[PDB]
Design a protein around this ligand. Structure first.
Ligand SMILES: Nc1nc2c(ncn2[C@@H]2O[C@H](COP(=O)(O)OP(=O)(O)OP(=O)(O)O)[C@@H](O)[C@H]2O)c(=O)[nH]1
Ligand SMILES: [Mg+2]
Lengths: 48, 428
């Protein structure tokens, strides 16, 4: 008589394989608004 | 000889000094560095090779508004310790300005005013500019009057207030700082010109026709007030008036020293050239009861005195004709103890033209510093706010926290109450 060869693979042996790592490369590139150039052009030079 | 020292305190004091000392710079020809490319003696000095240092102290517990003149073009004009600053603002607290943090900056202010008075060979007045609506302008400004009235006793101290407006405040504890600071401007002040922001807003709205004016435009017209005030101290004229004669032929019995300003050749270039801005028309717009720089209608008050300062190509025959037509009108009325009520003064210098500002080229000017019993209403409107707040002891923990006892609130209101009582007593 033959031996029924043991096929069997547990939960811990089956149901996860090493996943590919998540592809993350994205910073928050913020274009700076340039400082709005200032003429609240003062009193002395403004009127006299 | 012929020197006057301006004493700016409060943030509105620096900004009103930026316009006034500007106008004094042009009106004698000083360039922005301080060099002319001796009428100037009231405002500037002579420091060797044409240098012209102004006679001012810019005083503030908050460095921010005095830093913009220290970092703009005029660090090189003003002497760099004539711009005394502090660390913490008094922060709308009369207690902080007058008792707590004003008592460390008051040393540098009096030391510099003393140095600015030692180079004088006959000093006429102290033109103090302030704003009684806030912190260091109500606080340290009051204490500076206490120190000035005790070291310079004979000296006259003019004072251009910026008294709170009726419906416009920009501050909610403003009724406290106004009422509590009356005593500085009642017993330690010889001339108390009462100005407010709304009346300048209305003048800018209907006369200059700037619909949306800024504080810098408000400082335009108040600069024109002092130029006509010190006009006779600097340039020749038919009739001259100095600050001794403003406080003599205008001021009645000594507690009543509260005057109102009304410049009135206010016009801009779209209107200006279409009309004759002669002596008759500019003085009728001066006495008009909507051009007062107070939001205070003279039509329910009695003119006790008036000081017309005509300034330009003004002939004295037209002055005497103009005072006749304003005296024959019933809407303008005077107290019975006043047969003569005008101190006319003419300066030959034309009004200084305003490149790029708001006014236009006018050949003649007029400014009134008039004392009336109508001014008994600018304090009655602030009585109603003070009594409403102090009924529930609102906002008074901020005052008592730095060492301002709860008592002074009551006799500051009582001092203004005797001030009101003194004003209808004259008009009987
Ligand atoms: N005429 C004029 N008034 C001003 C100007 N800036 C502020 N004010 C008035 O000043 C009043 C209050 O005073 P503040 O501006 O707070 O200045 P302050 O006296 O130093 O008070 P603190 O800064 O809190 O110590 C406000 O009602 C404003 O209308 C200005 O540039 N010109
Ligand atoms: Mg301040």
């Amino acid at each position: 008589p033959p031996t029924l060869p043991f096929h069997g693979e547990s939960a811990y042996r089956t149901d996860y394989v090493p996943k590919p790592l998540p592809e993350v490369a994205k910073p928050v590139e913020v274009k700076l608004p340039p400082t709005l150039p200032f003429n609240a052009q003062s009193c002395y030079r403004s009127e006299y | 000889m012929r020197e006057v020292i301006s004493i700016h305190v409060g943030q509105a004091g620096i900004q009103i000094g930026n316009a006034c000392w500007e106008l004094f710079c042009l009106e004698h020809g000083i360039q922005p560095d301080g060099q002319m490319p001796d009428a100037f003696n009231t405002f500037f000095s002579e420091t060797g090779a044409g240098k012209h240092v102004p006679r001012c102290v810019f005083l503030d517990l908050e460095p921010t508004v005095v830093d913009e003149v220290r970092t703009g073009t005029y660090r090189h004009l003003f002497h760099p310790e004539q711009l005394i600053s502090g660390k913490e603002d008094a922060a709308n607290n009369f207690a902080r300005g007058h008792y707590t943090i004003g008592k460390e900056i008051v040393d540098l202010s009096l030391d510099r005013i003393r140095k600015l008075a030692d180079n004088c060979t006959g000093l006429q007045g102290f033109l103090m500019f302030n704003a009684v609506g806030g912190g260091t302008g109500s606080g340290l400004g009051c204490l500076l009057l206490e120190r000035l009235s005790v070291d310079y006793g004979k000296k006259s101290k003019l004072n251009f207030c910026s008294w709170p407006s009726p419906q416009v405040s920009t501050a909610v504890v403003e009724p406290y700082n106004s009422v509590l600071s009356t005593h500085s401007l009642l017993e330690h002040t010889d001339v108390a010109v009462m100005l407010d922001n709304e009346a300048i807003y209305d003048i800018c709205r209907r006369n200059l026709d700037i619909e949306r004016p800024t504080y810098t435009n408000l400082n335009r017209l108040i600069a024109q007030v002092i130029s006509s005030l010190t006009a006779s101290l600097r340039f020749d004229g038919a009739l001259n008036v100095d600050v001794t004669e403003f406080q003599t032929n205008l001021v009645p019995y000594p507690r009543i020293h509260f005057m109102l300003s009304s410049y009135a050749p206010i016009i801009s270039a779209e209107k200006a050239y279409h009309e004759q801005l002669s002596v008759a028309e500019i003085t009728n717009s001066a006495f008009e009861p909507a051009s007062m720089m107070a939001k205070c209608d003279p039509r329910h008050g009695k003119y006790m005195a008036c000081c017309l300062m005509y300034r330009g190509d003004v002939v004295p025959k037209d002055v005497n004709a103009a005072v006749a037509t304003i005296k024959t009108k019933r809407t303008i009325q005077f107290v019975d103890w006043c047969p003569t009520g005008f101190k006319c003064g003419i300066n030959y210098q034309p009004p200084t033209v305003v490149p790029g500002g708001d006014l236009a080229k006018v050949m003649r000017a007029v400014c009134m510093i008039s004392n009336s019993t109508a001014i008994a209403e600018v304090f009655s409107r602030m009585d109603h706010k003070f009594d409403l707040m102090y009924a529930k002891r609102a906002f008074v923990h901020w005052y008592v926290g730095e060492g301002m006892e709860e008592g002074e609130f009551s006799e500051a209101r009582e001092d203004l109450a005797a001030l009101e009582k003194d004003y209808e007593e004259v008009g009987i």
